[PDB]
């Protein structure tokens, strides 16, 4: 696996790499829904496309990659949402023309606290002063980790792979770390600090489907297809 | 801080003492909610006693106390099960006196899949030989880090204080992976592959308080108090 002989510098320009595109986007619960609905469809596709370059990604079964992606579409998105809104606090930008404001939450039902939960994240991102190389390494650990624990044989082995690239992704972050030199004992802080994020990650997905979900029972949502397939997964 | 002050060696030993003792046990959807039920209704008066004793979390004032008791109830409860289900594959042991098995889970609705990523978790604790010393360490981190980001002034303090007995916490098992002569890089591995378990833990409590909330929206719980007041704080 090209994964398992990239070294941290290799590794780091290949995800550096595939960063997808930014999109741009195109208010009432159903207008703001309708907005952010759609920009989440569209990076959807480029997710996909991201994906499939992420060093290790493409050796597993071509379902274990589409179950990856379904366990952590939303994950990766809220990632992403954050770190683009770092430096704007107290405000999320959703795109480079859509610039939320926390109180605009509010417009759709129960929103607000999600919109809480990605600023504090954002805000927390600000505070460690979190690199883009950082975010790119922390955006694959989750696509890899969030669906390893739902994959026999061939799972056992996948389950191998996935763990083996998890480790390489951990080296390149400590690599990284120490090249800014930080002490050994700050490059175990800072890698403890920054994977206990991604617990919050994870909860705040678990919420925002939930949400997204009244919002399409509620008859809010468009029939965005390629959404309702990743919203459907969970289900 | 004691917290603050005590050698990785104190910590670990004051974590080892928290521990509470084990309960044992007092089939329909109906039985079998209850007794898992009532079992999760006892442990929670032991568990606040042990959060008392969880080094620096004294330290955050009253409420703040509540709010990470409330916020990682659940997923306190599950580490245990999965910690002491670790030597019976397939099994999950509840108490010395209550072994289910996969397919018991069968008995309630939608409890299986609960039961499944219960037991994959179970499994990769087995798979990593999770040590005691280290499985004290985690659990104190979940109590901590979970309801960091829903906790002003005092808050970033209460927020610096958790983050900071974060890294002692971190420091400790660290330490603890030295003496068991580690390599400097197996223990950056180990130290992520410990914390990334901790993303399922949230993902599986959050799915774990949807049930119960069904559970009781069908009547089938019993009307413990102390269980109600934890899952009311999630709704
Ligand atoms: C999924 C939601 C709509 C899509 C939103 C989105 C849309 C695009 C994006 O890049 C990130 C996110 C984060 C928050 C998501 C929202 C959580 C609540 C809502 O239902
Ligand atoms: C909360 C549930 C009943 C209580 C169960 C329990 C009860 C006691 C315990 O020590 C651990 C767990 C783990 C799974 C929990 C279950 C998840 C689904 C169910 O509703």
């Given at each position: ?58 050796d597993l ?15 990766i ?62 955006k ?6 969030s ?34 030199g ?15 994020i ?38």
């Amino acid at each position: 696996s090209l994964a398992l002989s990239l070294t941290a510098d290799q590794m780091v320009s290949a995800l550096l790499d595939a960063e997808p595109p930014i999109l741009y986007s195109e208010f009432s619960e159903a207008s703001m829904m309708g907005l952010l609905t759609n920009l989440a469809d569209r990076e959807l596709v480029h997710m996909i496309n991201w994906a499939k370059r992420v060093p290790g990604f493409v050796d597993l079964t071509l379902h274990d990659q589409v179950h990856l992606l379904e366990c952590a579409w939303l994950e990766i998105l809220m990632i992403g949402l954050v770190w683009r809104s770092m430096e704007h606090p107290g405000k999320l930008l959703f795109a480079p023309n859509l610039l939320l404001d926390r109180n605009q939450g509010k417009c759709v039902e129960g929103m607000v606290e999600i919109f809480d939960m990605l600023l504090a994240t954002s805000s927390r991102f600000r505070m460690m002063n979190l690199q883009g190389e950082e975010f790119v390494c922390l955006k694959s650990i989750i696509l890899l980790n969030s669906g390893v624990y739902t994959f026999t044989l061939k799972s056992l082995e996948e389950k191998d792979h996935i763990h083996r690239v998890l480790d390489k992704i951990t080296d390149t972050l400590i690599h990284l770390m120490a090249k800014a030199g930080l002490t050994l004992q700050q490059q175990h802080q800072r890698l403890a600090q920054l994977l206990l994020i991604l617990s919050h990650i994870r909860h705040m997905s678990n919420k925002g489907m939930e949400h997204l979900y009244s919002m399409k029972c509620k008859n809010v949502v468009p029939l965005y297809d390629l959404l309702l397939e990743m919203l459907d997964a969970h289900r």
